[PDB]
Amino acid sequence: ALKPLKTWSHLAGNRRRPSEYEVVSTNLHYFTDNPERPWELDSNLPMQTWYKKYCFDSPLKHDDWNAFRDPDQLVYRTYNLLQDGQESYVQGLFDQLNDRGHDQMLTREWVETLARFYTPARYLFHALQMGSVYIHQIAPASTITNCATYETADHLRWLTHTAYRTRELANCYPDVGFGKRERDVWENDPAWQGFRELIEKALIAWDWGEAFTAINLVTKPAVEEALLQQLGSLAQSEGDTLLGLLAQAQKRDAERHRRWSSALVKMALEKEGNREVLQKWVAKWEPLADKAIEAYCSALPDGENAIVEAKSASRYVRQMMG
Amino acid sequence: ALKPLKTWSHLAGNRRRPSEYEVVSTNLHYFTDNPERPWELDSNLPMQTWYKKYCFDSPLKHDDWNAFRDPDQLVYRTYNLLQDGQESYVQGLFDQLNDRGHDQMLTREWVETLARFYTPARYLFHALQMGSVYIHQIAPASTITNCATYETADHLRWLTHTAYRTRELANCYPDVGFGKRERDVWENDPAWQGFRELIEKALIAWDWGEAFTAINLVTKPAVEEALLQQLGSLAQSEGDTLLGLLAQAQKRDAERHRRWSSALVKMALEKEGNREVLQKWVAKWEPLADKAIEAYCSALPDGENAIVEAKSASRYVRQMMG
Amino acid sequence: SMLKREDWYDLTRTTNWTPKYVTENELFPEEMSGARGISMEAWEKYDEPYKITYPEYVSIQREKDSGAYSIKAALERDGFVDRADPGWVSTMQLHFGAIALEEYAASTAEARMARFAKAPGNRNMATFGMMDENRHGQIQLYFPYANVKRSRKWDWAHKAIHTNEWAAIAARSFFDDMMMTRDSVAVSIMLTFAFETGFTNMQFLGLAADAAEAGDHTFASLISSIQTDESRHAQQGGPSLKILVENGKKDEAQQMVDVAIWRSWKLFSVLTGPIMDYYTPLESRNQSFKEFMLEWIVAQFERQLLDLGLDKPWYWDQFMQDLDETHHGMHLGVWYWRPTVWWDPAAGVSPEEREWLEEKYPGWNDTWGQCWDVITDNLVNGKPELTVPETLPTICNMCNLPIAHTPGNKWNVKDYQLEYEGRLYHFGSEADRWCFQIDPERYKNHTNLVDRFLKGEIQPADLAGALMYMSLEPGVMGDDAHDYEWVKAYQ
Amino acid sequence: SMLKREDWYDLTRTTNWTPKYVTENELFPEEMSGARGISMEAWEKYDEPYKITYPEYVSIQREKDSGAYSIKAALERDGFVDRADPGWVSTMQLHFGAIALEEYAASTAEARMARFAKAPGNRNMATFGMMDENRHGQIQLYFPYANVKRSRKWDWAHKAIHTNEWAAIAARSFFDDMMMTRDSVAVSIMLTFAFETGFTNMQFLGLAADAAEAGDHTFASLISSIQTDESRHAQQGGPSLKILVENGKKDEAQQMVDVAIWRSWKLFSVLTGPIMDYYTPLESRNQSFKEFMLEWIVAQFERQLLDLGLDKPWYWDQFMQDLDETHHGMHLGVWYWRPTVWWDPAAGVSPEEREWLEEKYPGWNDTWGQCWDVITDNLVNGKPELTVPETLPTICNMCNLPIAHTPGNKWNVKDYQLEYEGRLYHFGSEADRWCFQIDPERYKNHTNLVDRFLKGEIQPADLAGALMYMSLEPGVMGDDAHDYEWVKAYQ
Amino acid sequence: TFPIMSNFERDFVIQLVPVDTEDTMDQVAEKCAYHSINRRVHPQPEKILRVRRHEDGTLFPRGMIVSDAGLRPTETLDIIFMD
Amino acid sequence: TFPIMSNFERDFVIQLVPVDTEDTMDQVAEKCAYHSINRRVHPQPEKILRVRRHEDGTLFPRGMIVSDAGLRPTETLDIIFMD
Ligand SMILES: [Fe+3]
Ligand SMILES: [Fe+3]
Ligand SMILES: [Fe+3]
Ligand SMILES: [Fe+3]
């Protein structure tokens, strides 16, 4: 008879006793058990073909993607603990700054900058939410999928902050069109057309490794540097302490996403040929990210400097990954 | 045989089913069962005399002080839920503003104002902690005692914020004497002598009703208006966004203390003669509170206006209670 | 001050825009989105009845796990599992093996809708659904993990869906068809409306009650916590169905609901039916599986369908009839083929249980009871070897379950065979065959365990070879839960 | 970034200053502060070993209550209390009645130190202590409240300490002397060092284990949660004692520790001893009360005292001896006078229990067993009326407990009487009388229940009048826990 | 060697039963009976086991051999008690 | 009417027993016995119950009356088996 083990059979012989993270996160996708027929149905269905083409046939290769480990080791339980603390902070800021009358003290000129450069970000953050939830469903290992799960939740969190503040702004300045105008700004304003082109194209990159590169390695650092870093700094200097703080709070999530993205690239570099595969995708997407930063930041106050700093900070993210 | 009840015998016949607040808070002091011998020992011990003189013989009178109910209905469980949310907020501010480099951006002149007018408040807040924990132990009803319990914890919370920030300031500006000089400032600076005289005298007012009036009705609104309201406003205008926010966060506790203080005065006014008893104590203590506000606020920037506003805001607290 | 949710909630789902740099069909590929020629504008009519925002979510769900993990830690050294009724132990082993990794795969099915639904309210609710199934897959691993040192059968909480054991294949067959290989709108209908709203929402209420009744407060607290998450995401198919019906697609919608409810029923008849009528100790049986189905499932379906403008599936009357039969067959099949599962099936045919069965199902003793008579005589007469099989049952090519039905004095076992492109397929019911015929390219070249055996894929091609192919070895292979203790009543 | 606690912690207790507008003796009255001529500067040497700051406190304690209240809510409908061993039910009823309002009064004893201690680290730790006892008093009301509809005896969780029932008087006598009527420094020593560190910290560990063993996971989770709070505040007397010893006050310190440990012991001998040796079912008895005392209490005391530079109390050897005796008397007294308590005492003298008692206490059957022999014969022979009393026992004027000791073949019951200012006092031990003589003005004019009876204060002056004076009526008056089921073993 | 599916009278389940292309219907019923009679179905020795094609109800004579029956691999056959 | 405390031989507890100032020691022992013999102590009819002052061990003669014993109210008395 088979004797009881101390841990799951797939973790037996790990020396050190498995963490909660390993116990609940590892080796959970079963579609990868049978690469010739991922799903338990006829092998020629559109979804079987989708997964063979975009998961199994990706040029980004590893023989054991299940070995991947999130450096933050997030699980659902620890995600909600962490983010309930961070939301107590943000929701306190919202509550106490409204108290306060913070929005009433912003200048007319800044209020107009918010309508153009801040509130339309509900589209861009939702497009990131969609981007990362696509990575979720096509990644080849449950531990890679879970990083994308919690990142998706974060992008929804950013959308939600932006939705809330947009209402608070509309209440304070009902003549500006906060809440009503953002779609037309996102669709028609030159400042947003670099980003919108970038994210619309990135959203149809179906190969899991390309999706990861386009969204996490290229688009996100450009979005985060333009919209959190440069706009947040500008907010602070313009008297908008709420947005200055909000953007820094959101950047903590962005730093987390970069940490797992960096761990994954690290793992990919264990195999010959992967760096070149990643550098080629970076070289395809990088020029659209430039266009994005250029169009958005050039339109801000002290625009040219914003462009230069957004560009090197985002390139630096990839540089530090090799 | 005595049949089982739906609630505690002392609450039986309340129409509506008792709240958790009523179940765990009411009618818990047993020293009041035998006013001639409060404690289960010889009736002439110093503590028996202390309680007969300072609880039982107080001129502030009611036939059922156990009927008192905290308007916020706090119990230990709901206190810790509430304050863990508020501390997630304050601790986030501390964490994110340090990140940030907030303290590095304050002017030399403001830094000196902090050393004089902010950090020595660790003494004053601890003196309030002592004040309210004395009310705890001499109040005649457990529901009055519990309001003083949670208020004591709040004053400890304010001391703790001040201790933390004092260290952070000393780290940023090691030549100022943050952490080292506050005792000499509290003991010797004219700006603090109104407050120190007020609180040292108030700390020896042993009658429960006088202690309540001196600490909660007179001293606290003066402390809160000088140190949270006027200094916090000044902080904000001087670039110190942390202290501006910290003081507003602390004021939320102060507003809670005023809410239960107001409920208690309300209850006291049900009995003839109590208003006059309370107005006489207010008239004894009010001039020392004036001296306090005068000495502290006159020494601040735009000092004379601070005095006028601190004075009417604190008087207004008592006015709205009748 | 804070705004009221209702004042800003809509801005969270004002997220559709008109693509320019790519086309709409490129951004939302029809095989993934299933928008069915209904415009982006008409999908925006989607309005979920239960609303939740991120801050509320993380706060409520933090408290849920604080509670459930607290209960678990408090009760852990008590070792209840070691003194639990062995039919209860087997119920848990079955539950965890069948469900833990399918809960986790459901987060991918939610991710499908989150990316590909044209209804922005659906994309956000699916992001919360994706989170919820993440929770469910994780907590339903963390909980059984406590027991790994008690028995290798607890390893199957993780291992099962990675095997070719026949119940695992039957579970992947169901989930892969309902939720993993369908477009976003079909997933909203087949998974969230038909399966989650339709079956598991009430099933989990029942299961938590059974757990508490068994004295298992850890598992009762687990299941009851998971259950409170269900409606937040199970609500997503109702709105999709409304849009299909209001636009020109009521027949498409009817057909998806018909397929999904039938396949759900088949899974339920093997995973839940036997548990209620045979594994749960007699004195703990609140109602029969048939009674549970009529009170808590079937009526609710008719109500939902009526309100949506849909019809009762064509097979409804037959389905009602099968409540007297199907699960008795799935039980007898699982007990008879017990070494082929990873839990110990409870026979559940003592005199006392048999009179309970007779009341709940008049006719039982003279149909089902006949086979059980023979089995009981062999065990009484020292021929246990005739109570385990020496062949494979015929497996349905739709649901991947044995074709079984009323035996004994009202014998009514039928095979709804189909010859299609030169292959002969077998089906356990008229509805099963129909699910195939309405979409044969979805199932055509799939092979069940029997098909594989006959094709040469299981080697050695014998029963022992079949067990190894299914990853089963002594220590996990099932046997009678009560170690034949019930035989002593018959001598 | 955040600082490390250690970098700023001291500033939280840098809070002493030199008063100017009032004098130091006015601000810290000696009857309240107990600084004993030791300077403010020397009290500032006080350094608590376990440190905690407000933010940590609220966060950890929020999680504690989330857990404990979660366990309670999960297990509530299970109604365990209705099928619990009735000695277990009685253990809980006794626990709650004796302790809930004394926990709450302990927050006042903590408030005493918070206001009046000259050591600033003591004032802050006492503010956290004041909070902790607030929790304890509240949660130990919320929990039994669940049961009020089961029996009026559960009302006594709130009512008991408001009555003149003799065990209530004995509890207030103890708590009022140790913690409510002493200066801050004496409270730190008598309450936190001698009683909390010395007894309840380990008692609660034991009690939570017993609860779990009884199948009561709600009460096990309650008690185990409360227990984790204890050391945060129980630590406060150790530092006070160090300062008294290092300054000129070792004898004062020794005398407070001697009184406090003796009074604690007496309370423990009636509230805990009988529970372990007689109410807990035999097969659940891990060790004897004497064994528990030697392993977990007595050794730890000697260790603490040695490390502090103090001596074993003068009565230590006698105390060791009394571990064989005192609680057997308190049990027999409580069972014999059972209508005078609000729980049902468990006799605990079956043949099987009596052989357990004989092993744990050689000599039991021929001393204690003698009285129990007579009782058992009367119950066997239909004379139950001779198993309840028709008079009051003599009550000790220190501990307010019956004067009782070894009966039967080694009869050794003694009264350590004292005539003082024209009144004759009675004492159950040499130590009890000594606690009186070292401080007679603290106890002189107190009257125990017997004193009151004899003075005319209990009217009608008969047993029925005494019951009414004690607020006891049928429905709460105690009787045998197992309804004399154990008598059937003797016929 | 030829796979059929046996639907045995009074049993509850259809089962896979390999038969030989040279078997008579009588020898097929024997092979089937092995997996049902005394398992789950009581003997009926007053009766003769017959073979009919499940799909259309066609009765095969006792002596007819599998080779001549026109069966599809895996065809379902009822095995019924007759006289 | 006079309160004493009875410490009865072989009992485990001292008890309050009202006696009369006119009682003999014999009648005091009777009054005490009522609360101990057949309660908790077995009879000893080969023996005579005597009264001694607990504090100093002074034996009172059987016929001596309470009035003459020089007792403090509530005095503890041992009630012992003798011959
Ligand atoms: Fe789920
Ligand atoms: Fe679900
Ligand atoms: Fe406590
Ligand atoms: Fe304590």
> Can you give the three-state secondary structure of A286-320, one letter per residue?
HHHHHHHHHHHHHHCCCHHHHHHHHHHHHHHHHHC
**Chain-chain contact of D130 with B48 (C-beta, under 8 angstroms):** no
**Chain-chain contact of E55 with C417 (C-beta, under 8 angstroms):** yes
Query: Length of chain E, please?
Result: 83
C356-362, Cβ contacts within 8 angstroms, sequence gap of 24 or more = C356/C282, C356/C285, C357/C277, C360/C277, C360/C288, C360/C290, C360/C291, C361/C288, C361/C290, C361/C324, C361/C328
Query: What is the Cα–Cα distance from F72 to F66, expressed in whole angstroms?
Result: 11
Would you list the DSSP string of A81-144? HHHHHHHHHHHHHHHHHHHTTTGGGS-HHHHHHIIIIITTHHHHHHHHHHHHHHHHHH-SSHHH
How far is residue B136 from each of residues A308, B78, B133, measured CA to CA in Å?
A: 61, 19, 5
Give Cα D441 distance to the centre of its chain: 24
Give Cα B34 distance to the centre of its chain: 30
Tell me the Ramachandran region of residue C114: left when phi exceeds 0, alpha when psi lies from -120 to 50, beta otherwise.
alpha
CATH class of D1-491: mainly alpha
The residue with tokens 């035989």 is C487
Closest CA to D310 of D241, D236, D264, D261: D241
* Alpha helices per DSSP H over D235-325: 237-246, 250-271, 273-274, 289-293, 299-308, 316-322
Q: Cα dihedral sign for C89, C91, C97, C99?
A: negative
CA count, 13 A, side-chain hemisphere, C360: 24
Among chain D, residues having any CB pair with chain F shorter than 8 Å are 328-329, 332-333, 336, 368, 370-371, 373-375, 378, 386-387, 389-394, 402-409, 411, 413-415, 417, 419, 424, 426, 450, 453-454
Ligand with the closest atom to the CA of D232: 4
Ligand with the closest atom to the CA of C135: 1
Q: Which residues of D touch F5 (CB under 8 A)?
A: 394, 415, 426
Q: Cα dihedral sign for B282, B284, B290, B295?
A: negative
Query: What is the Cα–Cα distance from A133 to A139, expressed in whole angstroms?
Result: 10
Instruction: Strands of C344-460 (E only): list them.
Output: 418-420, 423-425
How far is residue D165 from each of residues B38, D162, D450, measured CA to CA in Å?
A: 17, 9, 12
Structure tokens at A24: 């609940």
Query: What is the Cα–Cα distance from B103 to B117, expressed in whole angstroms?
Result: 16
Q: How is residue A6 annotated by DSSP?
A: S
Closest CA to D411 of F16, F54, F34, F74: F54
* Alpha helices per DSSP H over D76-119: 86-116
The residue with tokens 């002596």 is E63
Query: What is the Cα–Cα distance from D338 to D334, expressed in whole angstroms?
Result: 5
Q: Which residues of D touch F39 (CB under 8 A)?
A: 371, 374-375, 378, 386-387
For residue C185, the one-letter residue type is: V
**Chain-chain contact of D407 with F10 (C-beta, under 8 angstroms):** yes
**CA-based R_g, chain B, Å:** 22
Could you tell me which residues come within 8 angstroms of residue D255 by beta carbon, excluding any fewer than 6 positions away? D438
D488-491, Cβ contacts within 8 angstroms, sequence gap of 24 or more = D489/D350, D489/D351, D490/D351, D490/D376, D490/D379, D490/D380, D491/D380
Task: Identify the CATH number of the domain in which residue B248 sits.
Answer: 1.10.620.20
Selected for mutation to probe chain F from D325, D377, D403 (highest F CB count within 10 Å) is D403
Distance from the alpha carbon of residue C196 to the mean position of ligand 2, in angstroms? 6
Closest CA to B95 of A88, A258, A76: A88
Structure tokens at A80: 């909600």
- According to CATH, what is the number of the domain E1-83? 3.10.20.270
Structure tokens at B220: 């606290």
CA count, 13 A, side-chain hemisphere, C315: 20
Could you tell me which residues come within 8 angstroms of residue A309 by beta carbon, excluding any fewer than 6 positions away? A225, A229, A230
Q: How is residue F37 annotated by DSSP?
A: B
How far is residue D279 from each of residues A262, C244, D276, D324, D353, measured CA to CA in Å?
A: 63, 69, 6, 17, 10
- The CA-based dihedral angle spanning residues B287, B291, B297, B302, taken in that order and rounded to the nearest 10 degrees: 80
Q: Are A139 and A148 in contact (CB under 8 A)?
A: yes
Could you tell me which residues come within 8 angstroms of residue B126 by beta carbon, excluding any fewer than 6 positions away? B155, B159, D15, D120, D123
Mapping DSSP to helix (H, G, I), strand (E, B) and coil, where does residue A14 land?
A: coil
CA distance A97 to chain B (A): 8
A83 touching B (Cβ < 8 Å): no
Q: Where are the domains of chain C?
A: 1-491
Could you tell me which residues come within 8 angstroms of residue C432 by beta carbon, excluding any fewer than 6 positions away? C262, C266, C396, C397, C398, C399, C416
Q: How is residue A226 annotated by DSSP?
A: I
**Chain-chain contact of F11 with D390 (C-beta, under 8 angstroms):** no
D5 touching B (Cβ < 8 Å): no
Q: Which residues of D touch C78 (CB under 8 A)?
A: 212, 217
Query: What is the Cα–Cα distance from C384 to C21, expressed in whole angstroms?
Result: 71
CB burial class (10 A; 0-12, 13-18, 19+) of residue D326? buried
Q: Which residues of C are annotated as a binding site?
A: 103, 133, 136, 196, 230, 233
Domain span at residue A111?
1-322
Nearest-by-Cβ selection for E3 from C406, C414, C454: C454
Angle of CA points E66, E72, E76, to nearest 5°: 85
**Chain-chain contact of B249 with A96 (C-beta, under 8 angstroms):** yes
* Alpha helices per DSSP H over C381-442: 430-437
Crossing angle of helices A190-202 and A274-299, rounded to 10°: 160
Structure tokens at B67: 């009927």
Resolution in A: 1.9
Beta bridge mates, D402 = D395
Instruction: Strands of D309-439 (E only): list them.
Output: 418-420, 423-425
Query: What is the Cα–Cα distance from B80 to D139, expressed in whole angstroms?
Result: 14
Chain E neighbours (≥3 Cβ pairs under 8 A) are C
Query: What is the Cα–Cα distance from A241 to D297, expressed in whole angstroms?
Result: 58
Q: Are D227 and D208 in contact (CB under 8 A)?
A: yes
Query: What is the Cα–Cα distance from C99 to C174, expressed in whole angstroms?
Result: 12
Q: Are D444 and D309 in contact (CB under 8 A)?
A: no
Cα diameter, chain D = 80
CB burial class (10 A; 0-12, 13-18, 19+) of residue B158? buried
Q: Cα dihedral sign for B299, B305, B306, B312?
A: positive
C111 touching A (Cβ < 8 Å): yes
Closest CA to D371 of B216, F13, B132, C418: F13
* Alpha helices per DSSP H over D398-462: 430-437, 449-455
The residue with tokens 């104002």 is B113
Beta bridge mates, C393 = E15
